[PDB]
Structure 1
Amino acid sequence: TKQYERKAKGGNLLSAFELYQRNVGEWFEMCRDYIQDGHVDESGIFRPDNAFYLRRLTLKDFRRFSLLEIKLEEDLTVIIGNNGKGKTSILYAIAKTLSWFVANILKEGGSGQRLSEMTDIKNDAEDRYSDVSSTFFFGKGLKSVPIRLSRSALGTAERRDSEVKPAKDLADIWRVINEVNTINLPTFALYNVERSQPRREERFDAYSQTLGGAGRFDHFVEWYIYLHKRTVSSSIKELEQQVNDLQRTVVSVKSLLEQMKFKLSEAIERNDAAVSSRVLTESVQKSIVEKAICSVVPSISNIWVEMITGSDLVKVTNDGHDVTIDQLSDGQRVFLSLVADLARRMVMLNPLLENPLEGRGIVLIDEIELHLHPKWQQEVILNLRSAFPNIQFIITTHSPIVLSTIEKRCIREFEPNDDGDQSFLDSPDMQTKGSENAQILEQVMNVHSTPPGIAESHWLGNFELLLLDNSGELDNHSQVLYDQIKAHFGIDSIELKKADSLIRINKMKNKLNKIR
């Protein structure tokens, strides 16, 4: 219609797509350009003209939350709070919403996941239903993609319907345009705490178990060895001719013939394979993943497959030493698995990008510090945004060490006294990036730098009060406590130095007071 034509010419993606579906080459090209156009910035990073991210989330009578509103950052949002504040609940809500996009990219009218009638409705909700409302952004042509997942409690008379059509409509654009001409596709992934627990490859395997079951070490190792074996050691007609020539010669050349036959079969398969499943060579895939791992994972500089010993072994250069991957801590293994899995999916879904890791997507990570030593907590987030510059990361942490590496604008904190009524999450008042750990504990996480339940933690305070009670002179009582401090903390302790300082200052103050 003329109205759709006007809106489409104005840059509206949905109108352009509707005109394409009713009819035609011009509208197709407009849709494809909307998805594929971008530029390389000053830093040499590809940037899509039309970014895709979650803009806002609202939770109504969901689990602990009566009504909660969250505004997310385009790049990184970190959610912090005590146990039981609902950090994992937030990620679960998002992952269920994302399941509707994944289902519909894979199949027309595919069904996503649903809220549980047994567990997900707030237990003391008067109106016995729950809503998860999300708004997504996809460039200036599609500023708002609203989705609502709803569920009514068991045995309630009126059922509340989920509203998922906008998700389906957007996912349809990706699916249909990709079917005609290969495009890059968005990555959706959830890595929950279960990551820690101990056919030929095809493009849309990248969506398999992406929102639960992702990031598992054994899957990586198997995949990596497989790729190595295939990539150890030309036209189809030329290859066909070479195979024919080698067959005529065929005993020492038999191994070469088998290799060439395999290469020919692969070339034919690639030739036969569809536009919707277009993929980079196994050699390239391997290289990208290796670089991702080495860039992101702390203290791994190199990774490779050895078969010299007679068993297939993945080796890594860890802190300058070549070791087997089984000699890594479980913390480092789990993190390696997460990055490898993510990189693998990105390579599969972004075949047209120079750097497939510059693709679009939303990645959710629960408890990023899981099993990590403090040393590696200080490094993990620095790396991730540099390696995946267009991914929206939504993460949860307990770690002040992690928070010391992140800007306060990326942080969303629960109030410690929040009994679930609170409307909006906000950023901390103090700047965290580059700040001292002890300050983040006190100012952001509401924890004393010394344990209040330990008596020895109060001795310096008590010592000071005794000094002040005896006009600054070291009496029998103050001496006893001084000796206790010395005995407990040691001669070179900061605590004893503070005590010594107090003595010196108070002596001098008293002398001045006497010089009246």
Structure 2
Amino acid sequence: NLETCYVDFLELESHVINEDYLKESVELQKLISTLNESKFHLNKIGIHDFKRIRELQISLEDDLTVFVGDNGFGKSTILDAIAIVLSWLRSNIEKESKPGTYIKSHEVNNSVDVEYASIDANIKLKDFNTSILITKAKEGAYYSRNNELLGVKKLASIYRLVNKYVDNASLPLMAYYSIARSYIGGGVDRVWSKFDVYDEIEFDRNDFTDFFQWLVFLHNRASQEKLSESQTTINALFSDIQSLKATLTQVIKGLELSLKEKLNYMKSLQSGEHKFNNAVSLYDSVINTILKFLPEFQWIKLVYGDDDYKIILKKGEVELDIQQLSQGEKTIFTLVGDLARRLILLNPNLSNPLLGYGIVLIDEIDLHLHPQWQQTIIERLTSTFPNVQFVITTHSPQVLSTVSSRSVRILQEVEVDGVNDLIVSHP
């Protein structure tokens, strides 16, 4: 009983003092164990008078659900509705009563019979359950019923309290890869990471530059920490900060920020972990993860020259930069790099960081891929990220031909009582 354990722990800590004993309290350890055992899951969702859809109840499996359908059959509507539902939970977790995304005026059905739009959802964590309803009526109409957010604020409170007690607490990933994952840049060829700053970022993705910066930082940490060649790094950083202070005594905001950065660098001794999951292990895991999806290439490196860093790939007998790749490997490299970036970043305690929990939504999985790549992408993604839940869409038969019978949902349009309505089915 997660709810009972949470209530008991809150009651015990509320009428107690000496936060040190609160940390030593077995209730917090039990809560942490219960949270770790629990796995993120979205069991079902109901849609009412949203866009083309007029009435629908959908249930999703534990691992992977794929919607196959023709053009104009509401495939993207399902993803947009799920994104809307997840937005409120994300906002509540990140900040106190943070407003989320609403339902736009044109989202409601165009028929004159409908007066309001509503979305209902349910989330299950092992044994605990919760639900949420979001509504938005039409223009110029009474009975403006409101939305219910008590359940999501309940869920959120547990996570924020757990992260407050333990600074190493993990969090669930929620991300959404839309059609926008493609641009002229294609997610490539568009000051400091500040160590780790947990990102409750928007589910969509627009900028990959962070990836580059973050990587550069991981490489510098890898060289300095595991390969030594730094001596008394903390003392040297403190001396650099002292010289900065002397220069300041002898643009002011920039100098102060640089001094704070020097102090943060000098805090490396304060951090002092050098654990089994060191920087070089993370670097090798990232590189081998990317190379798993690109069998043709041989090795990837980061070359420093002309006071700048660049990425070098080897194909056959010719070395290529990053600008010279095609769109096919640009898409795969960007998507995989961002997904593993978030996994490695939001779970700083696991021995193998690619084992967290989350939910990922992908639209049009088969963009810029030849059939040979289309026959094996889904198995690679499923095997690589085991404890994640995927929701993807596709219309290419080559994608569907290698999918199990229990994971495929087919959309159909059928006219009942003179009105065409969308239905779903299993083979």
Aligned-partner residue type, residue 130 of structure 1: A
Q: Does 1:368 align with 2:348?
A: no
Question: Aligned match of 1:192 in 157, 170, 178?
Answer: 178
1:135–1:146: 8 Å Cα contact kept in structure 2?
yes
Between the two proteins, the alignment pairs up a number of residues equal to 383
Aligned pairs for 1:107-126 within 5 A = 107-116=95-104, 118-124=105-111, 126=113
Q: Which is helix-richer, 1 or 2?
A: 1
Instruction: Give the Å deviation of 1:370.
Output: 1.4
Q: Does 1:389 align with 2:377?
A: no
* Residue 188 to residue 202, structure 1, CA distance change in 2 (3 Å): farther
1:346–1:359: 8 Å Cα contact kept in structure 2?
yes
Q: Does 1:155 align with 2:140?
A: yes
Indicate the structure whose relative CO is greater, using CA pairs within 8 Å and at least 6 residues apart: 2
* Counterparts of 1:74 and 1:320, CA distance in 2: 44
Q: Which one is further off, 91-100 or 316-325? A: 316-325
2:89–2:156: 8 Å Cα contact kept in structure 1?
yes
2:49–2:117: 8 Å Cα contact kept in structure 1?
yes
Q: Which is strand-richer, 1 or 2?
A: 2
* Counterparts of 1:83 and 1:393, CA distance in 2: 22
* Counterparts of 2:200 and 2:238, CA distance in 1: 40
Q: Does 1:15 align with 2:12?
A: no
Aligned-partner residue type, residue 28 of structure 1: L
Find the residue that maps to 1:396 and give its secondary structure.
Answer: strand
2:414–2:421: 8 Å Cα contact kept in structure 1?
no
Q: Who is 1:256 aligned against?
A: none
* Counterparts of 1:269 and 1:413, CA distance in 2: 55
* Residue 88 to residue 264, structure 1, CA distance change in 2 (3 Å): same
Instruction: Give the Å deviation of 1:132.
Output: 1.2
Instruction: Give the Å deviation of 1:422.
Output: 3.9
Aligned-partner residue type, residue 83 of structure 1: N
Aligned-partner residue type, residue 352 of structure 1: N
Question: Aligned match of 1:315 in 305, 312, 317?
Answer: 312
Aligned-partner residue type, residue 393 of structure 1: F
In the TM superposition, what whole-angstrom CA distance separates every residue of 1:232-284 from its partner, at most 9, and x where no partner exists? 4489996556778999xxxxxxxxxxxxxx998435168379xxxxxx76545
Find the residue that maps to 2:425 and give its secondary structure.
Answer: coil
RMSD: 3.4
Question: Aligned match of 1:208 in 178, 201, 206?
Answer: 201
1:217–1:334: 8 Å Cα contact kept in structure 2?
no
Instruction: Give the Å deviation of 1:289.
Output: 2.7
Instruction: Give the Å deviation of 1:82.
Output: 1.2
Q: Which one is further off, 51-60 or 152-161? A: 152-161
1:361–1:390: 8 Å Cα contact kept in structure 2?
yes
2:290–2:333: 8 Å Cα contact kept in structure 1?
yes
Instruction: Give the Å deviation of 1:421.
Output: 2.5
Instruction: Give the Å deviation of 1:405.
Output: 2.7
Find the residue that maps to 2:392 and give its secondary structure.
Answer: strand
Instruction: Give the Å deviation of 1:384.
Output: 0.8
Instruction: Give the Å deviation of 1:138.
Output: 0.5
Instruction: Give the Å deviation of 1:328.
Output: 2.4
Q: Which one is further off, 384-393 or 218-227? A: 218-227
* Counterparts of 1:30 and 1:135, CA distance in 2: 25
* TM-score normalised according to structure 2 size: 0.79
* TM-score normalised according to structure 1 size: 0.66
1:217–1:337: 8 Å Cα contact kept in structure 2?
yes
Q: Who is 2:116 aligned against?
A: 129
Aligned pairs for 1:110-509 within 5 A = 110-116=98-104, 118-124=105-111, 126-140=113-127, 142=128, 144-181=129-166, 182-197=168-183, 198=185, 200-201=193-194, 203-209=196-202, 211-213=203-205, 216-229=207-220, 231-233=222-224, 239-240=233-234, 265-266=264-265, 268=267, 271=270, 283-297=280-294, 299-300=296-297, 302-307=299-304, 312-318=309-315, 322-415=319-412, 417=414, 421-422=421-422, 425-427=424-426, 429=427
* Residue 414 to residue 100, structure 1, CA distance change in 2 (3 Å): same
Q: Who is 1:56 aligned against?
A: 44
Gaps of 5+ in 2: 16-21, 186-191, 242-260
Aligned-partner residue type, residue 157 of structure 2: D
Find the residue that maps to 1:183 and give its secondary structure.
Answer: coil
1:298–1:379: 8 Å Cα contact kept in structure 2?
no
Find the residue that maps to 1:357 and give its secondary structure.
Answer: coil
Aligned-partner residue type, residue 148 of structure 2: E
